[PDB]
Structure 1
């Protein structure tokens, strides 16, 4: 038996060309550690503000649009997991308690 297999994809038979190709424009993004990346795009294409560059980190466009911080939060930052189960009056009457233990233990 023979057991043919294929990595999933295709092979097309257009003979290659190199003269008429729809026209392209180049954008340029700038990442956080001062790197510059040139990306080609079609002319009928809305050039986005942020691009995941070759460096591995996101880079904004070179213009001054400033599109969105999008109001993304922390998540749970402990505290929040402390404040959701225990209230402020129970902590303030505890912390000061612990604070007084700093006063009594220091002198005996």
Structure 2
């Protein structure tokens, strides 16, 4: 039989090569974890990353990251109740339930 893992290789070595320049950017975690990351000089620095210690969101040493609201927390039972029913129906069922409870 013949088989191949989807992996590519090159006839090439580490000796006798000059490495391109890189810059170390520092990131900090909420709990105090700090780490360094090497990036190419001809690169853009993203504002947010994941931590190398506890796998939580982390920002740069200098903070310039605001919050943009995401639109998909809506799903609850309350908003569906608003969508399905008007306020008067909820008020009258509420009044009936209080009446029977205090009865």
- Fold in common (TM above 0.5): yes
> Could you say what the CA RMSD is over the residues aligned between the two structures, in angstroms?
2.0
2:20 maps to 22
C-alpha deviation, 1:18, in angstroms: 6.6
For residues 6-36 of structure 1, give each alpha carbon's deviation from its aligned partner in whole angstroms, at most 9, with x where no partner exists: 2111111122137621111112222333322
Unaligned 5+ segments in structure 2 are none
Alignment coverage as a number of residue pairs: 101
Unaligned 5+ segments in structure 1 are none
Q: TM-score by structure 1 length?
A: 0.77
Q: TM-score by structure 2 length?
A: 0.81
Distance across 1 between alignment mates of 2:7 and 2:30: 36
